[PDB]
Design an enzyme around this catalytic site. Structure first.
Site, PDB file in Angstrom:
ATOM      1  N   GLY A  63       0.717  -1.166  -0.032  1.00 26.09           N
ATOM      2  CA  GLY A  63       0.104   0.118  -0.136  1.00 26.09           C
ATOM      3  C   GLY A  63       0.834   1.254  -0.070  1.00 26.09           C
ATOM      4  N   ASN A 111      -8.630   4.191   4.373  1.00 28.41           N
ATOM      5  CA  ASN A 111      -8.371   4.664   3.180  1.00 28.41           C
ATOM      6  C   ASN A 111      -9.469   3.778   2.220  1.00 28.41           C
ATOM      7  OD1 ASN A 111      -7.258   2.332   1.229  1.00 28.41           O
ATOM      8  ND2 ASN A 111      -6.501   1.906   3.421  1.00 28.41           N
ATOM      9  N   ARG A 112      -9.770   4.221   1.023  1.00 28.96           N
ATOM     10  CA  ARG A 112     -10.718   3.455   0.095  1.00 28.96           C
ATOM     11  C   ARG A 112     -10.014   3.757  -1.150  1.00 28.96           C
ATOM     12  NH1 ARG A 112     -14.836   7.153   2.177  1.00 28.96           N
ATOM     13  NH2 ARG A 112     -14.953   9.093   0.839  1.00 28.96           N
ATOM     14  N   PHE A 115      -7.405  -0.013  -5.262  1.00 26.65           N
ATOM     15  CA  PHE A 115      -6.543  -0.518  -6.024  1.00 26.65           C
ATOM     16  C   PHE A 115      -6.273   0.376  -7.147  1.00 26.65           C
ATOM     17  CE2 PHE A 115      -6.017  -4.243  -3.682  1.00 26.65           C
ATOM     18  CZ  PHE A 115      -6.777  -5.348  -3.907  1.00 26.65           C
ATOM     19  N   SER A 181      -8.984  -6.907   0.471  1.00 27.11           N
ATOM     20  CA  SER A 181      -9.045  -5.337   0.583  1.00 27.11           C
ATOM     21  C   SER A 181     -10.617  -5.335   0.665  1.00 27.11           C
ATOM     22  CB  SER A 181      -8.817  -5.052  -0.838  1.00 27.11           C
ATOM     23  OG  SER A 181      -9.179  -3.674  -1.026  1.00 27.11           O
ATOM     24  N   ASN A 183     -12.047  -2.724  -0.096  1.00 17.95           N
ATOM     25  CA  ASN A 183     -12.529  -1.494  -1.249  1.00 17.95           C
ATOM     26  C   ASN A 183     -12.610  -1.969  -2.571  1.00 17.95           C
ATOM     27  OD1 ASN A 183     -11.999   0.417   0.989  1.00 17.95           O
ATOM     28  ND2 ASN A 183      -9.873   0.158   0.778  1.00 17.95           N
ATOM     29  N   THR A 184     -12.817  -3.318  -2.647  1.00 18.79           N
ATOM     30  CA  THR A 184     -13.213  -4.046  -4.059  1.00 18.79           C
ATOM     31  C   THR A 184     -14.319  -4.804  -4.021  1.00 18.79           C
ATOM     32  OG1 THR A 184     -10.896  -3.744  -4.651  1.00 18.79           O
ATOM     33  CG2 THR A 184     -12.250  -5.216  -5.799  1.00 18.79           C
ATOM     34  N   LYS A 221      -3.158 -13.112   2.061  1.00 21.80           N
ATOM     35  CA  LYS A 221      -3.536 -11.956   2.844  1.00 21.80           C
ATOM     36  C   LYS A 221      -4.992 -12.091   3.100  1.00 21.80           C
ATOM     37  CE  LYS A 221      -2.406  -7.279   4.054  1.00 21.80           C
ATOM     38  NZ  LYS A 221      -1.417  -6.127   3.528  1.00 21.80           N
ATOM     39  N   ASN A 250      -5.348  -7.444   7.084  1.00 19.91           N
ATOM     40  CA  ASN A 250      -5.350  -6.246   6.006  1.00 19.91           C
ATOM     41  C   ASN A 250      -6.091  -5.435   7.031  1.00 19.91           C
ATOM     42  OD1 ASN A 250      -6.166  -4.670   3.851  1.00 19.91           O
ATOM     43  ND2 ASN A 250      -5.933  -6.346   2.556  1.00 19.91           N
ATOM     44  N   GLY A 272      -3.861   1.404  11.690  1.00 19.84           N
ATOM     45  CA  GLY A 272      -3.403   1.843  12.896  1.00 19.84           C
ATOM     46  C   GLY A 272      -3.675   1.386  14.219  1.00 19.84           C
ATOM     47  N   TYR A 322       2.780   0.415   8.458  1.00 25.39           N
ATOM     48  CA  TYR A 322       2.258   1.095   7.400  1.00 25.39           C
ATOM     49  C   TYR A 322       2.100   2.521   8.216  1.00 25.39           C
ATOM     50  CZ  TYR A 322       0.732   3.466   3.096  1.00 25.39           C
ATOM     51  OH  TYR A 322       0.421   4.464   2.072  1.00 25.39           O
ATOM     52  N   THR A 323       0.848   2.520   8.737  1.00 23.68           N
ATOM     53  CA  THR A 323       0.168   3.700   9.210  1.00 23.68           C
ATOM     54  C   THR A 323       1.155   4.576  10.207  1.00 23.68           C
ATOM     55  OG1 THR A 323      -2.002   2.604   9.025  1.00 23.68           O
ATOM     56  CG2 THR A 323      -1.809   4.594  10.687  1.00 23.68           C
TER      57      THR A 323
HETATM   58  O1  LIG Z   1       1.089  11.413   5.902  1.00 25.79           O
HETATM   59  C1  LIG Z   1      -0.267  10.819   5.283  1.00 25.79           C
HETATM   60  O2  LIG Z   1      -1.284  11.620   5.817  1.00 25.79           O
HETATM   61  C2  LIG Z   1      -0.530   9.392   4.673  1.00 25.79           C
HETATM   62  C3  LIG Z   1       0.551   8.794   4.222  1.00 25.79           C
HETATM   63  C4  LIG Z   1       1.823   8.796   4.037  1.00 25.79           C
HETATM   64  O3  LIG Z   1       2.681   8.336   3.186  1.00 25.79           O
HETATM   65  N1  LIG Z   1       2.633   9.682   4.686  1.00 25.79           N
HETATM   66  C5  LIG Z   1       4.069  10.055   4.855  1.00 25.79           C
HETATM   67  C6  LIG Z   1       4.495  11.249   4.710  1.00 25.79           C
HETATM   68  F1  LIG Z   1       3.737  12.468   4.395  1.00 25.79           F
HETATM   69  C7  LIG Z   1       5.925  11.554   4.397  1.00 25.79           C
HETATM   70  F2  LIG Z   1       6.434  12.849   4.122  1.00 25.79           F
HETATM   71  C8  LIG Z   1       6.980  10.374   4.885  1.00 25.79           C
HETATM   72  C9  LIG Z   1       8.404  10.572   4.581  1.00 25.79           C
HETATM   73  C10 LIG Z   1       9.053   9.719   3.810  1.00 25.79           C
HETATM   74  C11 LIG Z   1      10.589  10.177   3.407  1.00 25.79           C
HETATM   75  C12 LIG Z   1      11.183  11.151   4.333  1.00 25.79           C
HETATM   76  C13 LIG Z   1      10.438  11.929   5.179  1.00 25.79           C
HETATM   77  O4  LIG Z   1      11.260  12.831   5.900  1.00 25.79           O
HETATM   78  C14 LIG Z   1      11.224  14.326   4.971  1.00 25.79           C
HETATM   79  F3  LIG Z   1       9.917  14.704   4.966  1.00 25.79           F
HETATM   80  F4  LIG Z   1      11.884  15.039   6.076  1.00 25.79           F
HETATM   81  F5  LIG Z   1      11.835  14.078   4.079  1.00 25.79           F
HETATM   82  C15 LIG Z   1       8.975  11.900   5.382  1.00 25.79           C
HETATM   83  C16 LIG Z   1       6.289   9.308   5.043  1.00 25.79           C
HETATM   84  F6  LIG Z   1       7.257   8.245   5.228  1.00 25.79           F
HETATM   85  C17 LIG Z   1       4.845   9.099   5.074  1.00 25.79           C
HETATM   86  F7  LIG Z   1       4.563   7.562   5.404  1.00 25.79           F
HETATM   87  C18 LIG Z   1      -0.365   7.691   3.625  1.00 25.79           C
HETATM   88  C19 LIG Z   1      -1.708   7.650   3.934  1.00 25.79           C
HETATM   89  C20 LIG Z   1      -1.903   9.178   4.742  1.00 25.79           C
HETATM   90  C1  LIG Z   2      -3.333   4.128   2.611  1.00 27.22           C
HETATM   91  C2  LIG Z   2      -3.178   2.416   2.617  1.00 27.22           C
HETATM   92  C3  LIG Z   2      -3.265   1.665   1.487  1.00 27.22           C
HETATM   93  C4  LIG Z   2      -3.193   0.307   1.268  1.00 27.22           C
HETATM   94  N1  LIG Z   2      -3.091  -0.347   0.138  1.00 27.22           N
HETATM   95  C5  LIG Z   2      -2.865  -1.715   0.710  1.00 27.22           C
HETATM   96  C6  LIG Z   2      -2.906  -2.576  -0.985  1.00 27.22           C
HETATM   97  O1  LIG Z   2      -3.011  -2.139  -1.782  1.00 27.22           O
HETATM   98  N2  LIG Z   2      -2.567  -3.835  -0.665  1.00 27.22           N
HETATM   99  C7  LIG Z   2      -2.839  -4.536   0.578  1.00 27.22           C
HETATM  100  O2  LIG Z   2      -2.658  -5.806   0.572  1.00 27.22           O
HETATM  101  N3  LIG Z   2      -2.897  -3.829   1.776  1.00 27.22           N
HETATM  102  C8  LIG Z   2      -2.907  -2.438   1.607  1.00 27.22           C
HETATM  103  N4  LIG Z   2      -2.917  -1.851   3.010  1.00 27.22           N
HETATM  104  C9  LIG Z   2      -3.110  -2.458   4.063  1.00 27.22           C
HETATM  105  C10 LIG Z   2      -1.738  -2.462   4.872  1.00 27.22           C
HETATM  106  O3  LIG Z   2      -0.724  -3.251   3.982  1.00 27.22           O
HETATM  107  C11 LIG Z   2      -1.797  -3.250   6.194  1.00 27.22           C
HETATM  108  O4  LIG Z   2      -2.601  -4.658   6.048  1.00 27.22           O
HETATM  109  C12 LIG Z   2      -2.717  -2.276   7.180  1.00 27.22           C
HETATM  110  O5  LIG Z   2      -2.810  -0.996   7.081  1.00 27.22           O
HETATM  111  C13 LIG Z   2      -2.383  -2.625   8.595  1.00 27.22           C
HETATM  112  O6  LIG Z   2      -1.236  -2.255   8.992  1.00 27.22           O
HETATM  113  P1  LIG Z   2      -0.793  -0.839   9.564  1.00 27.22           P
HETATM  114  O7  LIG Z   2      -1.723  -0.668  10.827  1.00 27.22           O
HETATM  115  O8  LIG Z   2       0.439  -0.572  10.274  1.00 27.22           O
HETATM  116  O9  LIG Z   2      -1.099   0.207   8.522  1.00 27.22           O
HETATM  117  C14 LIG Z   2      -3.158  -0.290   2.981  1.00 27.22           C
HETATM  118  C15 LIG Z   2      -3.202   0.532   3.872  1.00 27.22           C
HETATM  119  C16 LIG Z   2      -3.320   1.828   3.900  1.00 27.22           C
HETATM  120  C17 LIG Z   2      -3.378   2.480   5.004  1.00 27.22           C
HETATM  121  O1  LIG Z   3      -6.247  -0.192  -2.544  1.00 27.38           O
HETATM  122  C1  LIG Z   3      -6.985  -0.242  -1.527  1.00 27.38           C
HETATM  123  O2  LIG Z   3      -7.984   0.560  -1.254  1.00 27.38           O
HETATM  124  C2  LIG Z   3      -6.726  -1.080  -0.508  1.00 27.38           C
HETATM  125  C3  LIG Z   3      -6.384  -2.424  -0.597  1.00 27.38           C
HETATM  126  C4  LIG Z   3      -6.355  -3.329   0.454  1.00 27.38           C
HETATM  127  O3  LIG Z   3      -5.875  -4.337   0.501  1.00 27.38           O
HETATM  128  N1  LIG Z   3      -6.279  -2.619   1.686  1.00 27.38           N
HETATM  129  C5  LIG Z   3      -6.766  -1.514   1.903  1.00 27.38           C
HETATM  130  O4  LIG Z   3      -6.765  -1.085   3.153  1.00 27.38           O
HETATM  131  N2  LIG Z   3      -6.851  -0.586   0.895  1.00 27.38           N
END
Ligand SMILES: O=C(O)C1=C(C(=O)Nc2c(F)c(F)c(-c3cccc(OC(F)(F)F)c3)c(F)c2F)C=CC1
Ligand SMILES: Cc1cc2nc3c(=O)[nH]c(=O)nc-3n(C[C@H](O)[C@H](O)[C@H](O)COP(=O)(O)O)c2cc1C
Ligand SMILES: O=C(O)c1cc(=O)[nH]c(=O)[nH]1
EC number: 1.3.5.2
Length: 362
Positions: A63, A111-112, A115, A181, A183-184, A221, A250, A272, A322-323
């Protein structure tokens, strides 16, 4: 510095950019290597599973890098393994924006995306451009996983996954059949016993048809919202077909009582902290149902060494996050690894391997 990113950088960045834009920037910066200098992996964190060595058990969950654009930058961040995807056969845009929401008060995200994917062809060439580099990384304990999805308008789900196996299987250490997922439409129904057996039989046959050095492990998964019956059936099919492993879990479509975020009622998968224990308990159950003989990658709400260890003790051989990265930034990876190592020592484990499934033995 963990405090700086958590207390100033990330909060500031999130106050200037919407979640999707922030993610895009995150992918760009990571791909360019614009990351804070990172923790030295100790032998204690080494794990051998799925036919590979993992220098540390902390990976980036699917993701974050859906199209395989920042793999090397992610290893530089300190992840022991990287999983890209989900990737669909043909390119598709996903759902209309907004489709990702922050729940700061809950340290969660909803998130939604649906894919959104560049498609197999694009990802294929992107991975081929660094295929040999990955071969050396893998041999050095830094494996690559590829998560497979299906197109929204596909009429044959099984064929979509089969295509993914044929196109990206040769470039991955492990493949993930993502049938969880939320969202599908109808995707999660593929987790049912009958459909799952048929689907996985086809996926495995396709995988077995690949040349030896290009034959990846195959994992499934699953969702955190399965009934006890669903889990029993999945465990049964996995053992029947010889599935190599499971990714648990997931995101959840449930909304735990207590959520405070203003956006708690948005449609989508919740990730999260609120998902953490639901995921840990699912890992615990699947480990037991498979007699601890099926490798499990634990995912869901991991943001500290304790979170990681709880999943490992519950039965996970590896974990992903991830979160937590979206709230604490890159430094969280080193934090989790440092805390995990310290806890392993404090609890008398010789290493990660010794802790896998420990709760089931006490
Ligand atoms: O921040 C968000 O709201 C969300 C995501 C996200 O990818 N957030 C990141 C972000 F905004 C960053 F800027 C990140 C990074 C990534 C690389 C370097 C970074 O330090 C910097 F900005 F100083 F360069 C910060 C990062 F790892 C995230 F996951 C995914 C769903 C919502
Ligand atoms: C923005 C976002 C996008 C994601 N996209 C995918 C995806 O394409 N495929 C998948 O298998 N899981 C996806 N996930 C789920 C993560 O892989 C993971 O199973 C889930 O977020 C739980 O981990 P976390 O609480 O550390 O985020 C996504 C999650 C987030 C938050
Ligand atoms: O692409 C997406 O919306 C997605 C896929 C998945 O497997 N999990 C998730 O949280 N979002």
């Amino acid at each position: 510095d963990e405090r700086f990113y958590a207390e100033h950088l990330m909060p500031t960045l999130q106050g200037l950019l919407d979640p999707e834009s922030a993610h895009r920037l995150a992918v760009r910066f990571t791909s360019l290597g614009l990351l804070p200098r990172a923790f030295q992996d100790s032998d204690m964190l080494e794990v051998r599973v799925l036919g590979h060595k993992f220098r540390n058990p902390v990976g980036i969950a699917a993701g974050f890098d859906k199209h395989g654009e920042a793999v090397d930058g992610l290893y530089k961040m300190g992840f022991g393994f990287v999983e890209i995807g989900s990737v669909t056969p043909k390119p598709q845009e996903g759902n209309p924006r907004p489709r990702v929401f922050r729940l700061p008060e809950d340290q969660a995200v909803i998130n939604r995306y649906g894919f959104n994917s560049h498609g197999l062809s694009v990802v294929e060439h992107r991975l081929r451009a660094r295929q040999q580099k990955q071969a050396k990384l893998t041999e050095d304990g830094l494996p690559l996983g590829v998560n497979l999805g299906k197109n929204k308008t596909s009429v044959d789900a099984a064929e979509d996954y089969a295509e993914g196996v044929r196109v990206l299987g040769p470039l991955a250490d492990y493949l993930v059949v993502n049938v969880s997922s939320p969202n599908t439409a109808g995707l999660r129904s593929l987790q049912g016993k009958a459909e799952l057996r048929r689907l996985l039989t086809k996926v495995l046959q396709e995988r077995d048809g690949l040349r030896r050095v290009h034959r990846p492990a195959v994992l499934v998964k699953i969702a955190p919202d399965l009934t006890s019956q669903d889990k029993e059936d999945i465990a049964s099919v996995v053992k029947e077909l010889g599935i190599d492993g499971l990714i648990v879990t997931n995101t959840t479509v449930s909304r735990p009582a207590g959520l405070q975020g203003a956006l708690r009622s948005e449609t989508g998968g919740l990730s999260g902290k609120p998902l953490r224990d639901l995921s840990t308990q699912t890992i615990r159950e699947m480990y037991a149902l498979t007699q601890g003989r099926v490798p499990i990658i634990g995912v869901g709400g991991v943001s500290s060494g304790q979170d990681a260890l709880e999943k490992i003790r519950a039965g996970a051989s590896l974990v992903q996050l991830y979160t937590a990265l979206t709230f604490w930034g890159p430094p969280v990876v080193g934090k989790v690894k440092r805390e995990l190592e310290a806890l392993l020592k404090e609890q008398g484990f010789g290493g990660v391997t010794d802790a896998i499934g420990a709760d089931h033995r006490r």
